[PDB]
Design a protein around this nucleic acid. Structure first.
Ligand SMILES: [Mg+2]
Ligand SMILES: [Mg+2]
Ligand SMILES: [Mg+2]
Lengths: 94, 48, 157, 97, 227, 49, 231
DNA sequence: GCATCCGTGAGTCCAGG
């Protein structure tokens, strides 16, 4: 099972809402190169290459991690869509 | 092409018993007899 | 099922004894079988429970490791402050459940000890584990029951 | 087995353990000698087997025999298939089957 | 055809004097169990330890007798005694008798045992018995040095006429469990990764216990040498 | 796509009576129907495999 | 009460077979020793095998040579069973030549002999040749470990060379007995017998020693621990 | 109120040929 999936289902009021939260977050991180992560250097998901450990590329792994840390606000009608898009492009370039 | 036997090939007997090769263990893992002779195939009694 | 079954033997067949030492001596004479039911004094117990008493489950398994008894032999064990009459097989089952879900107390509460583990009981174990500990842990318990069930089937003979 | 007794080998310890097992299984008559009992088992088409990984015998006796097994035509070499993208249909423009 | 293997890496993970995990990867196919089963046998049968082999308790006739003044029965005190981890500090030592006299309202621990030269009680907060008002407990416990596990009725040793023989838990090891996983080395597909797990009592540590085990075998390899 | 070939089963000078076997075809062992192998079999569970 | 070194009996019957008794050993240890030795003796014991065949006027494995009863497939099945002993330890690889013809049942003796090379089953049948039937092989035989399929080692000494399955391990069987024995007042001691059969390329005793050596070398690996960086 | 005639439907995926 997914690391900490019972807590994740506890977080939302409908399992599919968690699914949409995870997918949206993972796309937000794919878009900015993970420069917007709420995870600390020590909490980064790692992938064990043949050379050595590197950042995990699976942005849905990153999404569910960040979700368990509590450092994200998820909900409906939080902010205008192009306002969020341009503020994220301002803070973390592409 | 000379086809050896691989994982996924289907074996069967004349009595209805059929099934796929799932595992090829090396000779040192096979159940063997007191005199050292290893068995060839390990069928599961749960079918019978 | 094979490990958590208990043996039922016919040699003893319900003899009466006064002191446990008389019963152990009788079993020594080959007169009574280890797991046959007898009645020492007014108590109806078995030679195996007296002859063999274990302070903790590790000891039970160390004995089964050394040939002393077998997992289906009924024996006496001290597990969680309790002086249980049960097999080392059922002790092992419960250890598998308990290490699987990483909660010895909840684990003990979940099992039915004094029964062979079958389809129905294992089923109710998974329903109960689901409800109590969650699906991540029930998946770990399931890989667990899977592992041992296959291992113990192989050598079960 | 007379091969074995002539070659100079007694009843191995593990055959003892399995014999006591099969005795509790009502498979042998108790008190008979190990040869008497192993013959009894064999006649039921069972033998002693030693887990090749451990050295230890199977907790009990196991049926072992010569069997006619056939290779059926359905080999995995012929069925493993996978496509990223391929050809499409004319009217529907969906992939071929 | 042409094979170029490399000698594996040995990895250790200990939690105190009680527990150790050991991962040795990569191993050519089949060698995971080739190393695992022996070391397990050795680690449960032939690691030298200490065990409470016999017990004398005053005015206590047999093992299934009662003790007036104490709430535990005799069997129970004998079990609690099975759980005592005693460690010989002098390699010469071979056997000790340990005496313990207490009375009145009190809960005897392993501390109450009278200290001896070259004898360390590793688990002194261990519980033996609680006595009441008028409860009197005089007992002598025999503690030897052996390997493995001996039922009480297999050594039968008696100092005196009323000494109870006690199943002897020699092994400082309480469990060994090893598990091999398939692991890959570039193009090599079927290599083995040996994970070993060792629970001790604290007299010996896991790493010490395993090193002792590997020694016995290495030494048994030398017995194939001069006919 | 199975291979159908025949193999010689007699050697030079062998006197053979009417109906004697001169060649083994596909899945034929000295004139018997050889649809497989005779292997040595143990009927016991095995670790889930 | 601590046991001591046991007595080591060795009964060899030629280069093929050997019994190796050890007694007395502590209870259980009959197995603790006898099984890993088995496993290392069925696999990881080096030996030799035919790895390639080139025949004259044979382009690939599914041919038939005129004047020859056997098909090439069958001839490689025969040639697999060839046992070829290397007397020199520096030697890695040998290309045996065979030229034969006429009415004759070519056997493994007919190979042109090489020094530091001995065919341990010269009576091994290979082919049945007919009037006018010829045969000119060049087989390549290598040292090696275990079982290396043709589809992997791909050994071709030339263009029409056939790669062949190589069963390198020269151990043909390993059984081990644990009998009951006593020493003084000790009961239930184990008496370890190891029956070993080989092909003659290496003898049972040499086998057992290299297996010993492998197991000991393997115990060497535990000697340098390392910290676990999981934390 | 009944027969009577009409059309419409009748498991999934996979291989070949
Ligand atoms: Mg007892
Ligand atoms: Mg309960
Ligand atoms: Mg492997």
């Amino acid at each position: 099972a997914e690391p900490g999936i019972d807590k994740l289902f506890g977080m939302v009021d409908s399992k599919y809402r968690l699914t949409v939260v995870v997918a949206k977050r993972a796309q937000q991180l794919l878009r900015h190169g993970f420069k917007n992560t709420v995870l600390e250097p020590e909490e980064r998901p790692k992938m064990q290459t043949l050379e050595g450990l590197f950042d995990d590329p699976n942005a849905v792994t990153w999404a569910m991690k960040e979700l368990l840390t509590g450092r994200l606000v998820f909900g409906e009608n939080l902010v205008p869509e192009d306002r969020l898009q341009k503020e994220m492009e301002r803070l973390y370039p592409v | 092409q000379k086809r050896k036997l691989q994982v996924g090939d289907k074996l069967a007997n004349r009595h209805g018993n059929k099934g796929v090769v799932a595992k090829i263990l090396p000779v040192e893992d096979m159940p063997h007899l007191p005199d050292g002779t290893p068995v060839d195939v390990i069928l599961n009694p749960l079918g019978v | 099922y094979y490990i958590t079954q208990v043996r039922k033997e016919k040699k003893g067949a319900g003899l009466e004894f006064a002191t446990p030492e008389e019963a152990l001596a009788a079993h020594e004479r080959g007169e009574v079988a280890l797991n046959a039911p007898i009645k020492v004094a007014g108590r109806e117990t078995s030679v195996g429970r007296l002859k063999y008493v274990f302070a903790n489950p590790d000891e039970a398994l160390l004995a089964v490791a050394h040939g002393i008894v077998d997992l289906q032999d009924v024996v006496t064990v001290r597990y969680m402050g309790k002086r249980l009459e049960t097999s080392p097989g059922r002790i092992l089952f419960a250890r598998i459940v308990a290490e699987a879900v990483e909660d010895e107390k909840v684990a003990w509460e979940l099992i039915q000890l004094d029964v062979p583990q079958e389809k129905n009981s294992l089923k109710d174990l998974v329903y109960q584990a689901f409800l109590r500990l969650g699906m991540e842990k029930t998946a770990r318990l399931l890989d667990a029951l899977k592992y041992y069930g296959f291992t113990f089937s192989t050598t079960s003979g | 087995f007379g091969k074995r007794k002539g070659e100079g080998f007694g009843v191995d310890k593990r055959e003892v353990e399995v014999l006591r097992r099969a005795e509790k299984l009502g498979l042998v008559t108790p008190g008979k000698t190990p040869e008497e009992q192993l013959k009894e088992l064999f006649l039921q088409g069972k033998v002693v087997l030693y887990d090749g990984r451990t050295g230890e015998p199977i907790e009990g006796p196991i049926v072992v025999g010569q069997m006619f097994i056939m290779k059926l035509y359905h080999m995995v070499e012929d069925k493993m298939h996978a496509r990223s993208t391929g050809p499409y249909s004319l009217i529907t423009q969906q992939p071929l089957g | 055809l042409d094979s170029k293997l490399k000698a594996p890496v040995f990895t250790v993970r200990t939690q105190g004097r009680e527990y150790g995990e050991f991962v040795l990867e990569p191993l050519e196919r089949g060698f995971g169990v080739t190393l695992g089963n022996p070391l397990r046998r050795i680690l449960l049968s032939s690691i030298p330890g200490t065990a409470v082999t016999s017990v004398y308790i005053e005015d206590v006739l047999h093992e299934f007798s009662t003790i007036p003044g104490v709430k535990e029965d005799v069997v129970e005190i004998i079990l609690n005694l099975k759980e005592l981890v005693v460690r010989f500090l002098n390699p010469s030592l071979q056997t000790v008798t340990l005496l313990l006299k207490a009375e009145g309202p009190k809960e005897v621990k392993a501390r109450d045992f009278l200290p001896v030269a070259d004898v360390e009680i590793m688990n002194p907060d261990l519980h033996i018995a609680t006595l009441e008002e008028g409860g009197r407990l005089n007992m002598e416990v025999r503690v030897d040095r052996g390997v493995g596990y001996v039922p009480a009725e297999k050594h039968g040793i008696k100092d005196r006429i009323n000494a109870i023989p006690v199943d002897a838990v020699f092994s400082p090891v309480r469990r060994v469990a090893f598990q091999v996983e398939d692991t890959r080395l570039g193009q090599r597909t079927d290599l083995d990764k040996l994970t070993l797990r060792i629970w001790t009592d604290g007299s010996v540590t896991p790493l010490e216990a395993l090193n002792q085990a590997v020694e016995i075998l290495r030494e048994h390899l030398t017995y194939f040498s001069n006919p | 796509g199975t291979a159908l070939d025949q193999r010689p089963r007699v050697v030079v000078g062998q006197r053979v009576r009417k109906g004697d076997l001169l060649a083994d075809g596909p899945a034929s062992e000295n004139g018997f129907l050889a649809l497989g192998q005779n292997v040595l079999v143990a009927i016991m569970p095995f670790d889930g495999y």
